Structure formats: C-alpha cells, structure tokens
C-alpha cells in the first residue's frame, strides 16, 4: 500500500486484473468500439455544425 502511494502520487494508473488476461480484454474491447462509435457520432455532428 506504500508502492501505490508512489505510483498514484506521480499520476500512474495501476491496472489490477485478478481474473484473466483474456476475459477483461473482451469486456474492454466491448467498450473501445462502443465509445469510438460515440466519437464517430459527435464528431460527425461537429463537422455538420462547422
């Protein structure tokens, strides 16, 4: 808990997994594209407004 006060002080973001390196990747790629589509919606609205 003292290494984490070094990491979180100078803005390091620890990624604890504790389940699998193949089950979180699916639930995280199910958010990357789901948020990239919101980028492609709002930036299309931006270029429509401009």
């Amino acid at each position: 808990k003292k290494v984490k006060r070094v990491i979180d002080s100078l803005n390091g973001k620890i990624v604890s997994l504790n389940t699998r390196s193949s089950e979180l990747v699916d639930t995280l790629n199910r958010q990357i594209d789901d948020l990239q589509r919101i980028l492609d919606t709002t930036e299309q609205t931006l270029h429509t407004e401009l």
């Binding site: 958010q31 789901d34 948020l35 589509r37 919101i38 919606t41 709002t42 609205t45």
Partner: protein, 159 residues
Amino acid sequence: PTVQSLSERKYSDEELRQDISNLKEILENEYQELTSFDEYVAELDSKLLCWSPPHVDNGFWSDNIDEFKKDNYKIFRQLIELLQAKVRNGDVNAKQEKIIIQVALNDITHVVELLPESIDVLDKTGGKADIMELLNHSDSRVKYEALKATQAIIGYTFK
C-alpha cells in the same frame, strides 16, 4: 424567449419600455412558478413532452431526482420505457414521434449528469440500447440530444 430579446433593444418612449418589462415578468413568472414534479409528470402522462424553460434548466432536475425514487427511480424508468417505445412502435422518422424523442433525451441527460445511480435503471430497462439507435436516425436535433445522452452514461462508466 422573444420578449427577452425585445427587452434589450429599448426604443425612446417611456410607455413602450414599461409595457415590455411588465410582459417579460408575467410570461416568465407564470410557467416557472408551477411545482417542478407536477409539470414533468403531467407531460409524462399525456406522452406529450415539450421543451419548456425548466426542462433545459439543471436546477429543476436536481430537486426532482428524489421525487422519482419509489422503486429505484420508477418515474425515471417510466420516461426511459416511454422513449424506447416511441422509437420502435409508431416508427421513428415521422414528425409526431420526433418531437417527443428530442425532448425526452434532453430530460434524461440532465438527471444522469447529476445522478450516478440512474445508470443502473438504463441498463435494466434496455434504454442503453435505445440511445445508440437514435444516433443513426435522421433529424439533426434528435441526433444532437441522442449524442449528449450517450456521452452522459459514458463519462460515468470509465473514471
């Protein structure tokens, strides 16, 4: 809104200035002074939601979050059901249904930004899915409001 612009451009005539000011007060006062929960529900009931001065105002939503909670924001879930339904039944992209949607998405956005616990309600109901659908849909105003809804959920999922 028209009166508020008019008020700025005063023209030389005492009586004119007087009339414009009196009219600004009456219009503004009469609508806002209704109870907040009441106006929202009256609109909800008719399924005849419209933008009004307190539905684009953040303060209205803050006082009203608590009023919804009756089984995990049951009223909030009512608006989510109502929005989902309009898209799917009576189709999307016809004029009637297009007024209700844009207003509803505006209303939802405000509660979510304010409250982090409403995210659960969107998931259970299936509202989460429905937002994604409005994005593709024609009508610029519906798409703006839809995009703002997506972003409101999104800010909270990842910290």
